[PDB]
């Protein structure tokens, strides 16, 4: 499918950006890279939406994904640096649903506009990745951090071991991404007709996935919830597959929507935990790599869940059994 | 003030672009101008947020307003051409949610992130202009039309008197813009602590302002409601000024929130009405002009409303009395 090829190229662009723009991030700086990546995302995204040739379309889509990866990593670094450690957690949580907000707003626009005309060409349902349609302005709306840095610099001028936690968090971040798309018993999107019902659900499920992850991790600790946010999907994925002995089609939805809680809470939280282990220096080398594994792990739905479709439980059990490995290694932190 | 000088420049950037970028929209086509303007919005908006020197801060804010002028006007021409005329009313209405979506999300992330720090070093409060912070999203999110145009154009390859209504609508669009900001007993919210309560109100009031303008103007006609959406602000602005004999501070809010209905429904509906009068040719010179006066009419908040504030009833009554000229000229259509 053309859309799935776009999504796979976009995920590969995210992987390449997250894996190759860390060294510039910690060498050149954490501010200039954001400006360069955003000022290239703009024209690159416009051209990708403009120049339609089916051969350069994927090239500019990959380039846009690479630049979006760079700007996302830079924005993450600036958020974790400028903000005070007392409330940095809330900023990071709000900085992880920014793409969720962009995608939900795009879908709401399409609904109120009633213009479902970019659909009806897609043979299969599109991948739900947020940043595919949550890039347009969500990151340029997150340019508020550039303003904050500008005012901080102006005020300043006026006044004038590690690898062990990287692999455990890398696998946890990778699994928490590649298992989110597996919580979809209705095909791999249930045709584009049901795409909005799943985009609203996934975005809406991410909203509550930041509530019990937003108000409890401070009291319970980031490691304690990460174990719970990885064992909740360790029960939400067996009864979904193994013990689904007449789940009456209603316990199939209370568990999948519960799976998207833990899967999207063990991916948001795992990104935060990588910051503490890595020092201020070379922070982007490893912290970007953790989501680089995660961004590369967004290949569940596009690469295999939609392409094969039939017998997709074999991927679900492999990833669900891999969650046991992540659970047994989370306590090792 | 430092912030309000951007708003005057942005509006003058919006007014200059709306008036000047009408010749290209009818000579160079309605699609290329969108790609050129939106392509340049990215780098321009980032550069304005990057190079902070108080002289380029407004220099690339004027240019950003000029570029966003073509984007809003260029999308509008494609909105009413690509979409079917049967449901063009909903698309154009939902297309006017460009300001609300981008602005509301900007103060959506800030509420969750609790990062109200860019408003600390700022005196009084910024003007409530949605596209000031709603520019990032809802325009590159409104690239769906470029996607839609690509599919339609690709499908084709597969198969291979007037001035009287301009002044009445121009004045109506201008008045309906410059009177909305006058529905504020506190100037711009006064202290910045009330800015979100006014941004949520104005955006929320614009939400219902598209409901009774969305479900009734089809049955009642665009001209009939425009008279009612201009005679409603002829009472919400008259009893707020003339008969405010102990409105007990609660009937004041039931009228301001009712004034923001009519003033933001006689500004959205007026833009739609001018589309039909002007033919398909020279549909950018005049249709842009109606909101070129309207965008130039967005100076009311940067005007006496916020600059001096004291005795600003004189500016409100002048516009309210001018609204009498607006309603009396509506039947002349
Ligand atoms: Fe991300
Ligand atoms: Fe506009």
Collect all residues of chain A within an 8 Å Cβ-Cβ radius of residue B142.
109
Residue B333 lies in a domain: no
Q: In this complex, which of B42, B91, B139 lies closest to A39 when CB atoms are compared?
A: B42
Which residue's entry shows tokens 């007990």?
B248
Disruptive mutation site among A74, A105, A218 for chain B (greatest number of B CBs within 10 Å): A105
Which residue's entry shows tokens 């309207």?
B294
User: CB distance A102–B49 less than 8 Å?
Assistant: no
Collect all residues of chain B within an 8 Å Cβ-Cβ radius of residue A41.
42
Residue B116 lies in a domain: yes
For residue B61 the two structure tokens come to 């804010």
User: CB distance A46–B35 less than 8 Å?
Assistant: yes
Residue B50 lies in a domain: yes
- Which residues, at least 6 apart from B178, have a Cβ–Cβ distance to it below 8 Å? B297, B298, B299, B300, B303, B319
Cα nearest neighbour of A120 on chain B: B151
Distance from the CA of A196 to the center of ligand 1, in angstroms?
A: 21
Distance CA B220, CA B226 (A): 10
Distance CA A11, CA A21 (A): 15
Q: How many domains does chain A have?
A: 1
Q: What is the dihedral of CA A79, A85, A87, A88, to 10 degrees?
A: 30
SS (H, E, C) A239-256: CCCCCCCCCCCCHHHHHH
User: Interior CA angle at B17 toward B14 and B21, to 5°?
Assistant: 150
Helix (H) or strand (E) run with residue B257 in it: helix B253-265
Distance CA A226, CA A277 (A): 15
For residue B83 the two structure tokens come to 């979409």
SS (H, E, C) B64-128: HHHHHHHHHHHHHHHHHHHCCCCCHHHHHHHHCCHHHHHHHHHHHHHHHHCCCCCCCCCCCCCCC
Closest CA to A198 of A208, A188, A207: A188
Closest CA to A317 of A266, A244, A223: A244
> What number of other Cβ atoms are within 10 A of residue A240's Cβ?
23
Q: A159: buried, middle or exposed (CB in 10 Å: 19+, 13-18, 0-12)?
A: exposed
User: CB distance B38–A52 less than 8 Å?
Assistant: no
Collect all residues of chain B within an 8 Å Cβ-Cβ radius of residue A156.
none
User: CB distance B114–A87 less than 8 Å?
Assistant: yes
**A78: domain range?**
2-330
Q: Confirm if A29 and A78 have CB atoms less than 8 A apart.
A: no
SS3 A308: coil
Disruptive mutation site among B31, B37, B41, B42 for chain A (greatest number of A CBs within 10 Å): B42
Minimal CA separation from A148 to chain B, in Å: 6
Q: Confirm if B140 and A136 have CB atoms less than 8 A apart.
A: yes
Distance CA B185, CA B179 (A): 13
User: CB distance A93–B109 less than 8 Å?
Assistant: no
Distance CA B111, CA A210 (A): 14
Give whole-number Cα distances, B249 to B185, B240, B254, B256, B259, in Å: 10, 11, 9, 11, 15
Q: Confirm if B108 and A101 have CB atoms less than 8 A apart.
A: yes
Which residue's entry shows tokens 């501070």?
B249
Closest CA to B179 of B126, B236, B134: B236
Distance CA A67, CA A62 (A): 9
Residue B73 lies in a domain: yes
For residue B172 the two structure tokens come to 């109506």
Distance CA A121, CA A123 (A): 6
Cα nearest neighbour of A90 on chain B: B113
Q: In this complex, which of A117, A121, A143 lies closest to B49 when CB atoms are compared?
A: A143
Collect all residues of chain B within an 8 Å Cβ-Cβ radius of residue A133.
141
Residue B188 lies in a domain: yes
- Which residues, at least 6 apart from A151, have a Cβ–Cβ distance to it below 8 Å? B117, B118, B121
Distance CA B270, CA A305 (A): 49
Residue B169 lies in a domain: yes
Q: Confirm if B262 and B212 have CB atoms less than 8 A apart.
A: no
User: CB distance A137–B142 less than 8 Å?
Assistant: no
Collect all residues of chain A within an 8 Å Cβ-Cβ radius of residue B50.
35, 146
Give whole-number Cα distances, B81 to A268, B69, B96, B99, in Å: 42, 19, 16, 21
- Which residues, at least 6 apart from A176, have a Cβ–Cβ distance to it below 8 Å? A230, A233, A263, A264, A266, A267, A270, A294, A297
User: CB distance B137–A102 less than 8 Å?
Assistant: yes
User: CB distance A137–B136 less than 8 Å?
Assistant: yes
> The domain that contains B290 carries what CATH number?
1.20.1250.20
- Which residues, at least 6 apart from B7, have a Cβ–Cβ distance to it below 8 Å? B126, B127, B129, B132, B301, B302
Declared resolution, Å: 3.3
Distance CA A37, CA A256 (A): 36
Residue B39 lies in a domain: yes
Distance CA A149, CA A78 (A): 8
Q: Confirm if A220 and A269 have CB atoms less than 8 A apart.
A: no
Distance from the CA of A72 to the center of ligand 1, in angstroms?
A: 6
User: CB distance B91–A35 less than 8 Å?
Assistant: no
B249: left (phi over 0), alpha (psi -120 to 50) or beta: left
Distance CA A56, CA B64 (A): 28
């Amino acid at each position: 499918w053309q859309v799935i090829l776009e999504q796979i190229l976009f995920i590969l662009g995210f992987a390449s950006g997250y894996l190759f723009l860390g060294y510039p991030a910690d060498r050149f700086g954490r501010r200039g890279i954001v400006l360069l990546t955003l000022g290239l995302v703009g024209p690159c995204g416009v051209g990708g939406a403009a120049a339609g040739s089916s051969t350069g379309i994927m090239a500019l889509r990959f380039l846009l994904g690479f630049l979006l990866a760079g700007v996302d990593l830079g924005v993450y670094l600036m958020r974790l640096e400028l903000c005070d450690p007392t409330q940095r957690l809330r900023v990071a949580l709000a900085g992880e649903l920014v793409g969720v907000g962009g995608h939900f707003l795009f879908l709401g626009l399409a609904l109120v506009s009633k213009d479902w005309r970019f659909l009806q060409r897609m043979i299969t349902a599109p991948c739900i990745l947020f940043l595919f349609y949550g890039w347009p302005g969500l990151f340029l709306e997150s340019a508020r951090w550039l303003i904050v840095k500008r005012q901080i610099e102006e005020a300043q001028s006026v006044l004038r071991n590690i690898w062990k936690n990287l692999l455990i968090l890398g696998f946890t971040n990778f699994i928490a991404h590649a298992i989110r798309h597996c919580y979809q018993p209705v095909g791999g999107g249930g045709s584009p007709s049901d795409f909005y019902l799943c985009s609203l659900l996934a975005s809406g499920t991410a909203a509550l996935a930041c509530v019990f992850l937003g108000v409890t991790v401070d009291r319970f600790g980031r490691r304690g919830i990460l174990l719970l946010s990885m064992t909740l999907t360790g029960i939400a994925s067996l009864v979904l597959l193994g013990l689904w002995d007449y789940l009456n089609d209603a316990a199939i939805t209370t568990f999948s929507v519960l799976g998207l809680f833990s899967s999207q809470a063990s991916a948001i939280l795992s990104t935060l935990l990588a910051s503490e282990i890595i020092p201020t220096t070379v922070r982007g080398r490893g912290l970007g790599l953790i989501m680089a594994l995660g961004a590369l792990g967004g290949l569940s739905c596009p690469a295999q869940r939609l392409h094969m479709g039939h017998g997709a439980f074999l991927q679900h059990v492999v990833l669900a059994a891999c969650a046991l490995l992540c659970i047994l290694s989370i306590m090792l932190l």
